[PDB]
Amino acid sequence: RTVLVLIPSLANTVFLETLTGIETVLDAAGYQMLIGNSHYDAGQELQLLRAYLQHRPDGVLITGLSHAEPFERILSQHALPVVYMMDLADDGRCCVGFSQEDAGAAITRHLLSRGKRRIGFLGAQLDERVMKRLDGYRAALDAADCRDAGLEWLDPQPSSMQMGADMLDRALAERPDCDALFCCNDDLAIGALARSQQLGIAVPERLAIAGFNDLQPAAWCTPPLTTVATPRRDIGVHAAKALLQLIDGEEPASRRADLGFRLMLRRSSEG
């Protein structure tokens, strides 16, 4: 009857599409969805699994591949079926996701294609997927001999639009020559874009801006925001479908489902 879903955040909206997809599958099969919000903390992720034990979940949907030490032990000791989301494991674990790195290299290559050569990176939160995003951006820049530590900005606090505007201020003061920003999440990109307009900066002519995820507000910016559509809803759908089968001792369609991504190319980079 019940499945536990563990996600690192509610506020940033990234995983709302994902909850909605799971529910579509769980409701159709009569399961109840329980939600654990770990706030990107492995300690609380643990405390949530422990605490949610008393609810007798039949299976668990887990975000990400990195987890606290005893985490995996509890899952096996209780023989709990699990599907992992957002990433791709290379060790048998059942998972649905896509290549964070390919995504990051792809959006970066798009910026290069637009004639930009001093492309910065805006990082916030700094979880595992953000850094994979970073690896792609770096690998794209290395191929073009355009890499520069002076154009990467990684800040540990949680993302927000205010923070996107603040990071923009810092980047353009340090490096007024920066001609594009790839932001690790749309909230940051949205803030940096609104701030850039406020500062009278021509976008994309002087500065192109791209985000990540294609959260709802991205298409509805002025100018519309270039970003990477990640299949967050389809990840929840596929992850649920596959866990249900695992609960019924069956073989899911795939043990490692790469749903890819699309580049959403808009005026904020294409003019």
Give exposure, 179-209, as e/b (b: 16+ Cβ within 10 Å): bbbbbbbbbbbbbbbbbbeeeebebbeebbb
Are 223 and 193 within 8 A, CB to CB? yes
**In angstroms, what CA-CA distances link 42 with 7, 12, 69, 73, 86?**
11, 18, 9, 14, 16
Which residue type does 132 have? K
- The closest of 51, 62, 77, 67 to 22, measured between CA atoms, is 62
Give a three-class secondary structure readout of 136-195: HHHHHHHHCCCCCHHHEEEECCCCCHHHHHHHHHHHHHHCCCCCEEEECCHHHHHHHHHH
Rounded CA gap, 159 and 220, in Å?
19
- The closest of 14, 122, 3, 11 to 64, measured between CA atoms, is 14
Q: How many CB atoms lie within 10 A of CB 172?
A: 20
Resolution in A: 2.3
Orientation angle between helical segments 128-143 and 100-113, nearest 10 degrees? 40
Rounded CA gap, 95 and 83, in Å?
5
Residue 15 backbone dihedrals phi, psi, to 5 degrees: -100, 0
Which residue type does 260 have? G
Domains in the chain (CATH in brackets) are 1-97+231-260 (3.40.50.2300), 98-230+261-271 (3.40.50.2300)
Rounded CA gap, 158 and 185, in Å?
11
- The closest of 157, 229, 169, 164 to 190, measured between CA atoms, is 164
What are the beta bridge partners of residue 2? 32
Element (H, E) at 229: strand 227-229
Are 228 and 213 within 8 A, CB to CB? yes
Rounded CA gap, 159 and 181, in Å?
15
DSSP state of 224: P
Rounded CA gap, 132 and 84, in Å?
17
What are the beta bridge partners of residue 227? 264
Structure-determination approach: X-ray
DSSP for 62-130, please give it.
EE-S---TTHHHHHHHTT--EEEEES--SSS--EEE--HHHHHHHHHHHHHHTT--SEEEEEES--HHH
